[PDB]
Amino acid sequence: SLTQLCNRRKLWADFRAAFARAKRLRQPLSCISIDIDNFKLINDQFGHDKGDEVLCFLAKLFQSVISDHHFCGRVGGEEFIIVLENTHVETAFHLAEQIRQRFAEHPFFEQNEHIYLCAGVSSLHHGDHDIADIYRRSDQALYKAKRNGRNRCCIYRQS
């Protein structure tokens, strides 16, 4: 049911309803973009079923680390998005870091392979009119994180 909790279609719709709800209720709304480092190498070396185990563990990890309500979506081959209602961006950043760390700390497969991820974080801003305004910022923070290597987290700033 991890492929059910991280359904891409449901994610975007839940995210859009959350955006409108967030503006209407004036609540903070945070967004984390995650990309698994070297996921292609993992599938090349261990195969598709094992690559899938990694994805599954990461989804399980989201639940364990984020006890409060949240939406998840696998939006690309190895990219996830987490949407956190009524959550300030710093709290989301801290959650993102915990996910990064526990993923890096989990040994995988008979040979205790270590796998890493990067994350970018942002949240609803006043001038926003679409979830794409938020995703653009978390996506950019993700790629900013990736500039310094694997296993990195960044919060978006306009600075």
UniProtKB/Swiss-Prot annotation:
Annotated consequence of substituting residue 77 to R: 3-fold decrease in biofilm formation. 60% decrease in diguanylate cyclase activity. Does not affect the overall structure
Residues covered by the GGDEF domain: 27-158
Domain of life: Bacteria
Active-site annotation: 78
Disulfide bridge map: none
Binding site for Mg(2+): 35-36, 78
Function (record text): Involved in biofilm formation. Catalyzes the conversion of GTP to c-di-GMP.
Comment on protein domains: The disordered N-terminal region is not required for diguanylate cyclase activity.
Protein name from the UniProt record: Diguanylate cyclase
Organism: Vibrio cholerae serotype O1 (strain ATCC 39541 / Classical Ogawa 395 / O395)
